[PDB]
Amino acid sequence: PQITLWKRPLVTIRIGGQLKEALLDTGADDTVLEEMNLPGKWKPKMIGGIGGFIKVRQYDQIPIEICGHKAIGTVLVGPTPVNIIGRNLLTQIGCTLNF
Amino acid sequence: PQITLWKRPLVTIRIGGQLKEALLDTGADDTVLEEMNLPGKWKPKMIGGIGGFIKVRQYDQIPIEICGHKAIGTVLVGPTPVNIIGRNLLTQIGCTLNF
Ligand SMILES: CC[C@H](C)[C@H](NC(C)=O)C(=O)N[C@@H](Cc1ccccc1)[C@H](O)CN(CC(C)C)S(=O)(=O)c1ccc(OC)cc1
Incomplete structure (x- = not known):
């Protein structure tokens, strides 16, 4: 899609089988989600x-x-x-900024 | 232009007599600049x-x-x-997210 910016660029995501709303955030290096359970190992x-x-x-x-x-x-x-989708994943989905 | 997100989307901005580097930031509602002594009235x-x-x-x-x-x-x-260009100005330059 092409997404304009007069509102926050919030989109639905699906992770660990659950739907959430998340902010497409070009100013974020990384993806950061609100407290939730995810399977597998993690590190601090x-x-x-x-x-x-x-x-x-x-x-x-x-x-x-x-x-x-x-x-x-x-x-x-x-x-x-807020749930944030950062550049590590925005790049994976082919997201670019255009003007 | 088209700006990919492999790296931080930093661009050159001008405000005053200071050219600065700023992030094109879809996650920012407002534009936030590093400390500078701008003239004029302000509100906290x-x-x-x-x-x-x-x-x-x-x-x-x-x-x-x-x-x-x-x-x-x-x-x-x-x-x-970091200097942050938020949606309030990104809309004015016709900036979109595209994938
Ligand atoms: C990956 C960690 C983190 C998410 C990210 N940091 C980095 C280093 O990428 C970040 O804070 N990213 C910031 C930008 C950023 C980058 C580096 C250092 C400091 C900030 C974000 O894009 C905009 N901000 C609002 C967000 C948090 C909803 S915001 O900056 O907190 C913000 C909040 C309110 C605003 O106006 C109402 C405008 C901007």
Whole structure:
């Protein structure tokens, strides 16, 4: 799709069999989802943004369908203000910025 | 132009006499610039992201050129680690996400 930006670019994602809403975030290096259970091993990680750093759980090689497009990659889980799809997965689904 | 997301989507902006590098950020509602002593009236604001909230100064109707495209609107100024072009200005330069 072509998505304009007069509203937040929120899309439905499917992960671990569940539907969620998530923000397509070109200013995010990584994908960070609100607290949830995901299967498999994870490792502790810290990530930072505008207000400082937070602790997250890093799950590698997780499948996620974003607005109908398949990705499989690293998903961070922790106290993010909103579910965020970052560049690691935006690149996988062929997302570009255009003007 | 088309901008891929393999790397941070940094572009050159002009506001004042300072050319700066800023992120084209679809995850940002508002535009947030690194500390700079802009002239004019402002209002205090708090904005929140990963790690919590920071205090910024809200300046209105500020001309900013983004990649040679003229925009004018609200810019938030404070202790962000990166200059952030938000949706309020991305819409004005006709920027979309595409996949
Ligand atoms: C991967 C971790 C994290 C998500 C990301 N950090 C990095 C290093 O990519 C980030 O915070 N990304 C930021 C941009 C960024 C990048 C690097 C360092 C600091 C910030 C994000 O794109 C915009 N922000 C709003 C979001 C959190 C809903 S925001 O910046 O917090 C924000 C919040 C409110 C705004 O206006 C209301 C505008 C912007």
